[PDB]
CSV table of C-alpha atoms and ligand atoms in Angstrom, one decimal:
chain,number,residue,atom,x,y,z
A,1,UNK,CA,0.0,0.0,0.0
A,2,UNK,CA,2.2,2.8,1.4
A,3,UNK,CA,5.8,3.7,0.2
A,4,UNK,CA,8.8,1.8,1.7
A,5,UNK,CA,12.4,3.2,2.0
A,6,UNK,CA,15.2,0.7,2.7
A,7,UNK,CA,18.9,1.6,3.1
A,8,UNK,CA,21.3,-1.2,2.1
A,9,UNK,CA,25.0,-1.2,2.9
A,10,UNK,CA,26.0,-3.6,0.2
A,11,UNK,CA,23.1,-4.7,-2.1
A,12,UNK,CA,24.0,-7.9,-4.0
A,13,UNK,CA,26.4,-8.7,-1.2
A,14,UNK,CA,26.9,-11.2,1.6
A,15,UNK,CA,27.8,-8.4,4.0
A,16,UNK,CA,24.5,-6.5,3.4
A,17,UNK,CA,22.9,-4.6,6.3
A,18,UNK,CA,19.4,-3.2,5.9
A,19,UNK,CA,18.0,-0.1,7.6
A,20,UNK,CA,14.2,0.5,7.4
A,21,UNK,CA,13.9,4.3,7.2
A,22,UNK,CA,10.1,3.9,6.8
A,23,UNK,CA,9.4,1.5,9.8
A,24,UNK,CA,12.6,1.2,12.0
A,25,UNK,CA,14.1,3.3,14.7
A,26,UNK,CA,15.9,5.6,12.3
A,27,UNK,CA,13.4,7.2,9.8
A,28,UNK,CA,13.7,9.2,6.6
A,29,UNK,CA,10.9,11.7,6.0
A,30,UNK,CA,10.0,14.5,3.4
A,31,UNK,CA,12.4,13.8,0.4
A,32,UNK,CA,13.5,17.1,-1.2
A,33,UNK,CA,13.2,16.0,-4.9
A,34,UNK,CA,12.7,12.6,-6.4
A,35,UNK,CA,12.3,14.0,-9.9
A,36,UNK,CA,15.0,15.1,-12.4
A,37,UNK,CA,16.6,18.2,-14.2
A,38,UNK,CA,17.6,18.2,-17.8
A,39,UNK,CA,19.9,20.5,-20.0
A,40,UNK,CA,18.7,20.1,-23.6
A,41,UNK,CA,21.3,22.4,-25.4
A,42,UNK,CA,18.7,24.3,-27.4
A,43,UNK,CA,20.4,26.8,-29.7
A,44,UNK,CA,18.1,29.0,-31.9
A,45,UNK,CA,18.8,30.4,-35.4
A,46,UNK,CA,16.5,33.2,-36.6
A,47,UNK,CA,13.6,32.2,-34.4
A,48,UNK,CA,13.8,28.5,-35.5
A,49,UNK,CA,14.8,26.1,-32.7
A,50,UNK,CA,17.4,23.4,-32.9
A,51,UNK,CA,17.8,20.8,-30.1
A,52,UNK,CA,21.1,19.2,-29.1
A,53,UNK,CA,21.5,16.3,-26.6
A,54,UNK,CA,19.8,16.1,-23.2
A,55,UNK,CA,22.0,15.7,-20.2
A,56,UNK,CA,19.7,14.4,-17.5
A,57,UNK,CA,21.1,15.8,-14.3
A,58,UNK,CA,20.1,14.2,-10.9
A,59,UNK,CA,19.7,16.5,-7.9
A,60,UNK,CA,20.7,15.9,-4.2
A,61,UNK,CA,18.0,14.2,-2.0
A,62,UNK,CA,17.7,15.7,1.4
A,63,UNK,CA,15.7,13.7,4.0
A,64,UNK,CA,14.3,14.8,7.4
A,65,UNK,CA,16.1,12.2,9.5
A,66,UNK,CA,14.3,11.3,12.7
A,67,UNK,CA,15.3,8.8,15.5
A,68,UNK,CA,12.9,6.9,17.6
A,69,UNK,CA,14.9,6.0,20.8
A,70,UNK,CA,13.5,5.2,24.2
A,71,UNK,CA,16.4,7.0,26.1
A,72,UNK,CA,19.0,9.6,25.4
A,73,UNK,CA,21.4,6.6,25.3
A,74,UNK,CA,19.4,4.9,22.5
A,75,UNK,CA,19.0,8.0,20.3
A,76,UNK,CA,22.8,8.7,20.5
A,77,UNK,CA,23.6,5.0,19.7
A,78,UNK,CA,21.3,5.2,16.7
A,79,UNK,CA,23.1,8.3,15.3
A,80,UNK,CA,26.6,6.9,16.1
A,81,UNK,CA,25.6,3.6,14.3
A,82,UNK,CA,23.4,4.6,11.3
A,83,UNK,CA,25.8,7.5,10.1
A,84,UNK,CA,28.9,5.4,10.6
A,85,UNK,CA,27.4,2.4,8.6
A,86,UNK,CA,26.9,4.8,5.6
A,87,UNK,CA,30.5,6.0,6.1
A,88,UNK,CA,32.0,2.4,6.3
A,89,UNK,CA,30.9,1.6,2.7
A,90,UNK,CA,32.0,4.1,-0.1
A,91,UNK,CA,28.4,4.2,-1.3
A,92,UNK,CA,24.9,3.2,0.0
A,93,UNK,CA,21.9,1.8,-2.0
A,94,UNK,CA,18.6,3.4,-1.3
A,95,UNK,CA,15.6,1.3,-2.3
A,96,UNK,CA,12.3,3.1,-3.3
A,97,UNK,CA,9.4,0.7,-3.0
A,98,UNK,CA,5.7,1.1,-3.9
A,99,UNK,CA,2.6,-0.9,-5.0
A,100,UNK,CA,3.8,-0.7,-8.7
A,101,UNK,CA,7.6,-0.5,-8.5
A,102,UNK,CA,10.8,-1.4,-6.6
A,103,UNK,CA,13.6,1.0,-7.9
A,104,UNK,CA,17.0,1.5,-6.3
A,105,UNK,CA,19.4,4.6,-6.2
A,106,UNK,CA,23.1,4.5,-5.3
A,107,UNK,CA,23.8,7.4,-2.8
A,108,UNK,CA,26.9,8.9,-1.3
A,109,UNK,CA,26.8,10.9,2.0
A,110,UNK,CA,26.8,14.6,1.1
A,111,UNK,CA,25.9,16.3,4.5
A,112,UNK,CA,24.5,15.1,8.0
A,113,UNK,CA,23.6,17.4,10.9
A,114,UNK,CA,23.8,16.8,14.7
A,115,UNK,CA,22.3,19.5,17.0
A,116,UNK,CA,21.3,19.7,20.8
A,117,UNK,CA,17.6,20.6,20.1
A,118,UNK,CA,16.0,17.5,21.6
A,119,UNK,CA,12.4,16.5,22.3
A,120,UNK,CA,11.4,13.8,24.8
A,121,UNK,CA,13.9,11.1,25.8
A,122,UNK,CA,16.6,12.8,23.8
A,123,UNK,CA,14.8,12.6,20.4
A,124,UNK,CA,16.6,13.6,17.1
A,125,UNK,CA,15.2,15.7,14.2
A,126,UNK,CA,18.1,16.4,11.7
A,127,UNK,CA,18.6,16.8,7.9
A,128,UNK,CA,20.6,14.3,5.9
A,129,UNK,CA,21.7,15.1,2.3
A,130,UNK,CA,22.9,12.6,-0.3
A,131,UNK,CA,24.7,12.9,-3.6
A,132,UNK,CA,23.3,10.9,-6.6
A,133,UNK,CA,25.6,8.3,-8.2
A,134,UNK,CA,22.9,6.5,-10.3
A,135,UNK,CA,19.2,7.4,-9.9
A,136,UNK,CA,16.6,4.6,-10.2
A,137,UNK,CA,17.6,1.2,-11.5
A,138,UNK,CA,15.9,-2.3,-11.4
A,139,UNK,CA,17.9,-5.0,-9.6
A,140,UNK,CA,16.4,-8.3,-11.0
A,141,UNK,CA,17.3,-12.0,-11.6
A,142,UNK,CA,18.3,-13.0,-15.1
A,143,UNK,CA,17.7,-16.6,-16.3
A,144,UNK,CA,18.0,-18.5,-19.5
A,145,UNK,CA,14.9,-19.7,-21.6
A,146,UNK,CA,14.3,-23.3,-22.6
A,147,UNK,CA,12.9,-24.5,-26.0
A,148,UNK,CA,10.4,-27.4,-26.1
A,149,UNK,CA,9.4,-29.7,-29.0
B,1,UNK,CA,46.2,8.7,-40.9
B,2,UNK,CA,44.5,6.6,-38.2
B,3,UNK,CA,46.5,4.5,-35.6
B,4,UNK,CA,44.9,1.1,-34.7
B,5,UNK,CA,45.8,-1.6,-32.1
B,6,UNK,CA,44.8,-5.1,-33.3
B,7,UNK,CA,46.0,-8.7,-32.7
B,8,UNK,CA,48.4,-10.2,-35.4
B,9,UNK,CA,46.6,-11.6,-38.6
B,10,UNK,CA,48.0,-15.2,-38.3
B,11,UNK,CA,46.4,-17.4,-35.6
B,12,UNK,CA,49.8,-18.9,-34.8
B,13,UNK,CA,51.2,-15.4,-33.8
B,14,UNK,CA,49.8,-14.5,-30.4
B,15,UNK,CA,51.1,-10.9,-30.3
B,16,UNK,CA,49.0,-7.7,-30.0
B,17,UNK,CA,50.3,-5.1,-32.5
B,18,UNK,CA,50.0,-1.4,-33.3
B,19,UNK,CA,49.6,-0.3,-37.0
B,20,UNK,CA,49.1,3.0,-38.9
B,21,UNK,CA,46.2,3.2,-41.4
B,22,UNK,CA,46.3,4.8,-44.8
B,23,UNK,CA,43.5,2.6,-46.2
B,24,UNK,CA,39.8,3.3,-47.0
B,25,UNK,CA,36.5,1.3,-47.3
B,26,UNK,CA,36.9,1.6,-51.1
B,27,UNK,CA,40.3,0.8,-52.8
B,28,UNK,CA,39.3,3.1,-55.7
B,29,UNK,CA,37.7,6.1,-53.9
B,30,UNK,CA,34.5,7.6,-55.4
B,31,UNK,CA,33.3,11.2,-55.0
B,32,UNK,CA,30.1,11.8,-53.0
B,33,UNK,CA,27.6,14.7,-53.5
B,34,UNK,CA,25.8,16.0,-50.3
B,35,UNK,CA,24.2,19.1,-48.6
B,36,UNK,CA,25.1,20.7,-45.2
B,37,UNK,CA,22.2,22.7,-43.6
B,38,UNK,CA,22.7,25.7,-41.2
B,39,UNK,CA,21.0,23.7,-38.4
B,40,UNK,CA,24.1,21.4,-38.0
B,41,UNK,CA,25.9,24.3,-36.0
B,42,UNK,CA,28.3,24.9,-39.0
B,43,UNK,CA,31.7,26.7,-38.4
B,44,UNK,CA,33.2,28.3,-41.5
B,45,UNK,CA,36.9,29.4,-41.5
B,46,UNK,CA,39.5,29.8,-44.3
B,47,UNK,CA,42.7,27.7,-44.4
B,48,UNK,CA,45.8,28.1,-46.6
B,49,UNK,CA,47.3,24.9,-48.2
B,50,UNK,CA,50.2,26.6,-50.2
B,51,UNK,CA,52.4,29.4,-48.9
B,52,UNK,CA,52.4,32.3,-51.4
B,53,UNK,CA,52.8,36.1,-50.6
B,54,UNK,CA,50.0,38.6,-49.5
B,55,UNK,CA,50.9,42.1,-50.9
B,56,UNK,CA,49.4,42.0,-54.5
B,57,UNK,CA,51.0,45.3,-55.6
B,58,UNK,CA,54.8,45.8,-55.7
B,59,UNK,CA,56.8,49.1,-55.4
B,60,UNK,CA,60.0,47.5,-56.9
B,61,UNK,CA,63.3,49.4,-56.6
B,62,UNK,CA,66.4,48.7,-58.8
B,63,UNK,CA,69.9,49.8,-57.7
B,64,UNK,CA,71.9,52.0,-60.1
B,65,UNK,CA,75.2,50.6,-61.3
B,66,UNK,CA,77.1,53.9,-61.5
B,67,UNK,CA,76.0,55.2,-58.1
B,68,UNK,CA,75.9,51.7,-56.4
B,69,UNK,CA,72.7,53.2,-55.0
B,70,UNK,CA,68.9,53.2,-55.4
B,71,UNK,CA,69.0,56.6,-57.1
B,72,UNK,CA,66.7,55.6,-59.9
B,73,UNK,CA,62.8,55.8,-59.4
B,74,UNK,CA,60.7,52.7,-58.7
B,75,UNK,CA,58.7,50.6,-61.1
B,76,UNK,CA,55.2,49.5,-59.9
B,77,UNK,CA,53.8,46.0,-60.7
B,78,UNK,CA,50.2,44.9,-60.4
B,79,UNK,CA,48.7,41.4,-60.5
B,80,UNK,CA,45.6,41.0,-62.7
B,81,UNK,CA,42.5,38.9,-61.6
B,82,UNK,CA,43.5,36.2,-64.1
B,83,UNK,CA,46.9,35.6,-62.5
B,84,UNK,CA,49.3,37.5,-64.8
B,85,UNK,CA,51.7,40.3,-63.5
B,86,UNK,CA,52.1,43.6,-65.5
B,87,UNK,CA,53.8,47.0,-64.9
B,88,UNK,CA,51.2,49.5,-63.5
B,89,UNK,CA,52.2,52.1,-66.2
B,90,UNK,CA,51.4,49.6,-69.0
B,91,UNK,CA,47.8,49.2,-67.9
B,92,UNK,CA,45.1,50.6,-70.3
B,93,UNK,CA,41.9,49.0,-68.9
B,94,UNK,CA,38.7,50.0,-66.9
B,95,UNK,CA,39.7,48.3,-63.6
B,96,UNK,CA,37.4,45.3,-64.0
B,97,UNK,CA,40.4,43.0,-64.6
B,98,UNK,CA,42.2,44.4,-61.5
B,99,UNK,CA,41.7,43.4,-57.8
B,100,UNK,CA,39.0,44.9,-55.5
B,101,UNK,CA,41.6,45.8,-52.8
B,102,UNK,CA,45.2,46.9,-53.2
B,103,UNK,CA,47.6,45.1,-50.8
B,104,UNK,CA,51.1,46.6,-51.4
B,105,UNK,CA,54.7,46.1,-50.4
B,106,UNK,CA,58.1,47.7,-51.2
B,107,UNK,CA,60.7,45.4,-52.6
B,108,UNK,CA,64.5,45.9,-52.9
B,109,UNK,CA,66.6,44.1,-55.5
B,110,UNK,CA,70.3,43.9,-56.3
B,111,UNK,CA,71.4,43.9,-60.0
B,112,UNK,CA,72.8,40.5,-61.2
B,113,UNK,CA,76.5,40.0,-62.3
B,114,UNK,CA,75.3,40.6,-66.0
B,115,UNK,CA,73.8,44.0,-65.0
B,116,UNK,CA,70.2,43.2,-66.3
B,117,UNK,CA,67.1,44.1,-64.2
B,118,UNK,CA,65.4,41.3,-62.2
B,119,UNK,CA,63.0,39.0,-64.3
B,120,UNK,CA,59.2,39.8,-64.3
B,121,UNK,CA,58.7,36.1,-63.4
B,122,UNK,CA,60.9,36.3,-60.3
B,123,UNK,CA,58.8,39.3,-59.0
B,124,UNK,CA,55.5,37.4,-60.0
B,125,UNK,CA,56.3,34.5,-57.6
B,126,UNK,CA,56.5,37.0,-54.7
B,127,UNK,CA,53.2,38.8,-55.5
B,128,UNK,CA,51.4,35.6,-56.6
B,129,UNK,CA,48.2,34.5,-54.7
B,130,UNK,CA,47.9,31.8,-52.0
B,131,UNK,CA,45.4,28.9,-51.9
B,132,UNK,CA,42.2,30.3,-50.2
B,133,UNK,CA,40.5,27.1,-48.9
B,134,UNK,CA,37.2,26.8,-46.9
B,135,UNK,CA,36.9,24.6,-43.8
B,136,UNK,CA,33.5,23.4,-42.6
B,137,UNK,CA,32.9,21.9,-39.1
B,138,UNK,CA,29.4,20.5,-38.7
B,139,UNK,CA,27.2,17.8,-36.9
B,140,UNK,CA,26.9,14.3,-38.3
B,141,UNK,CA,23.8,13.9,-40.5
B,142,UNK,CA,22.1,10.5,-39.9
B,143,UNK,CA,20.2,10.8,-43.2
B,144,UNK,CA,23.6,10.8,-45.1
B,145,UNK,CA,26.5,9.8,-42.8
B,146,UNK,CA,30.0,11.1,-43.7
B,147,UNK,CA,33.0,9.2,-42.3
B,148,UNK,CA,36.7,10.2,-42.3
B,149,UNK,CA,38.8,9.7,-45.6
B,150,UNK,CA,35.8,10.2,-48.0
B,151,UNK,CA,35.9,12.4,-51.1
B,152,UNK,CA,32.8,14.8,-50.8
B,153,UNK,CA,31.1,17.7,-52.7
B,154,UNK,CA,29.3,19.8,-50.1
B,155,UNK,CA,26.4,22.3,-50.8
B,156,UNK,CA,26.3,25.1,-48.2
B,157,UNK,CA,24.0,28.2,-48.4
B,158,UNK,CA,23.7,27.9,-52.2
B,159,UNK,CA,27.5,27.6,-52.8
B,160,UNK,CA,29.3,24.3,-53.7
B,161,UNK,CA,32.5,23.4,-51.9
B,162,UNK,CA,34.6,20.3,-52.9
B,163,UNK,CA,37.0,18.3,-50.7
B,164,UNK,CA,37.4,15.6,-48.0
B,165,UNK,CA,36.5,14.7,-44.4
B,166,UNK,CA,39.8,15.2,-42.4
B,167,UNK,CA,38.7,14.7,-38.8
B,168,UNK,CA,35.7,13.5,-36.6
B,169,UNK,CA,35.0,14.4,-33.0
B,170,UNK,CA,33.4,11.8,-30.7
B,171,UNK,CA,31.9,13.8,-27.8
B,172,UNK,CA,29.2,13.1,-25.2
B,173,UNK,CA,26.8,15.6,-26.8
B,174,UNK,CA,27.5,15.6,-30.6
B,175,UNK,CA,29.3,13.8,-33.4
B,176,UNK,CA,31.0,16.4,-35.7
B,177,UNK,CA,33.1,16.4,-39.0
B,178,UNK,CA,36.0,18.6,-40.3
B,179,UNK,CA,35.6,19.2,-44.1
B,180,UNK,CA,38.6,20.5,-46.0
B,181,UNK,CA,38.0,22.0,-49.5
B,182,UNK,CA,40.9,20.7,-51.6
B,183,UNK,CA,40.7,23.6,-54.0
B,184,UNK,CA,41.8,23.1,-57.7
B,185,UNK,CA,38.4,24.5,-58.9
B,186,UNK,CA,39.3,26.1,-62.4
C,1,CA,CA1,28.1,-4.0,-4.2
């Protein structure tokens, strides 16, 4: 039904670690932009328009990162863990999931914030920005086809 | 020329080799006739194949034997539109057979051992015109593709230019060609 956001350390890998940013303790909210920007190289001669090649540019995704710890100790351990896990691997695979599709985007940590403006039981509300490596790709199994008489 | 890395022709020889290419898709090259539209981001610039001098008019001075000085007045030589070189004083025409702009230079010559003035032909070589050649850089047309080392006859803005495809740029955005007009028109 609703949208799902997984954060994989190494998708396709034996050492994969999955973070549910939609259901788990560390949650991602309000993505900045999931769309795209394009530079079409349109040069015009005497009012007539000629179009070059479109360079589809992908923009940084900024999430409202929230932590759901029970104690100040929990919320700090969640920030010290989640952020370092993204740092340990050179790039992290964000999975976009919905009723119709299951796309993936390879992200690199652009900016993470840590402030002392806490709620109840030391709750965290910070902004996490990621740089786009490759936006939306389908990771699927490939198998041979058999021919029958 | 095009440099290419390719494994040795014989299956016995396991070596990877580097060779230089001076070969074409056709052994006996044929001339193509095509059109280049202004939409292909065309860049027109003039190249010079042969080195010949640029001052079409010559204020020629001849040194006097008796004074061993340039005491005598100069003789002016003008190159006609046809290609011939005549003395300016000898001209009796209406200006139609002479150039549209007068590029001039002053030349100094020393009299030969015989004492005779320098040959008209020797002056002619120095005032003679250079090969004005047109270069066209444009986008690759998928309707009629033009590859490197192909003899072509390009139509651009109502004017016909004849020559070959010298270079080709493989970029991320476009695929472009360098056309060099070989000249030798009349
Ligand atoms: Ca991997």
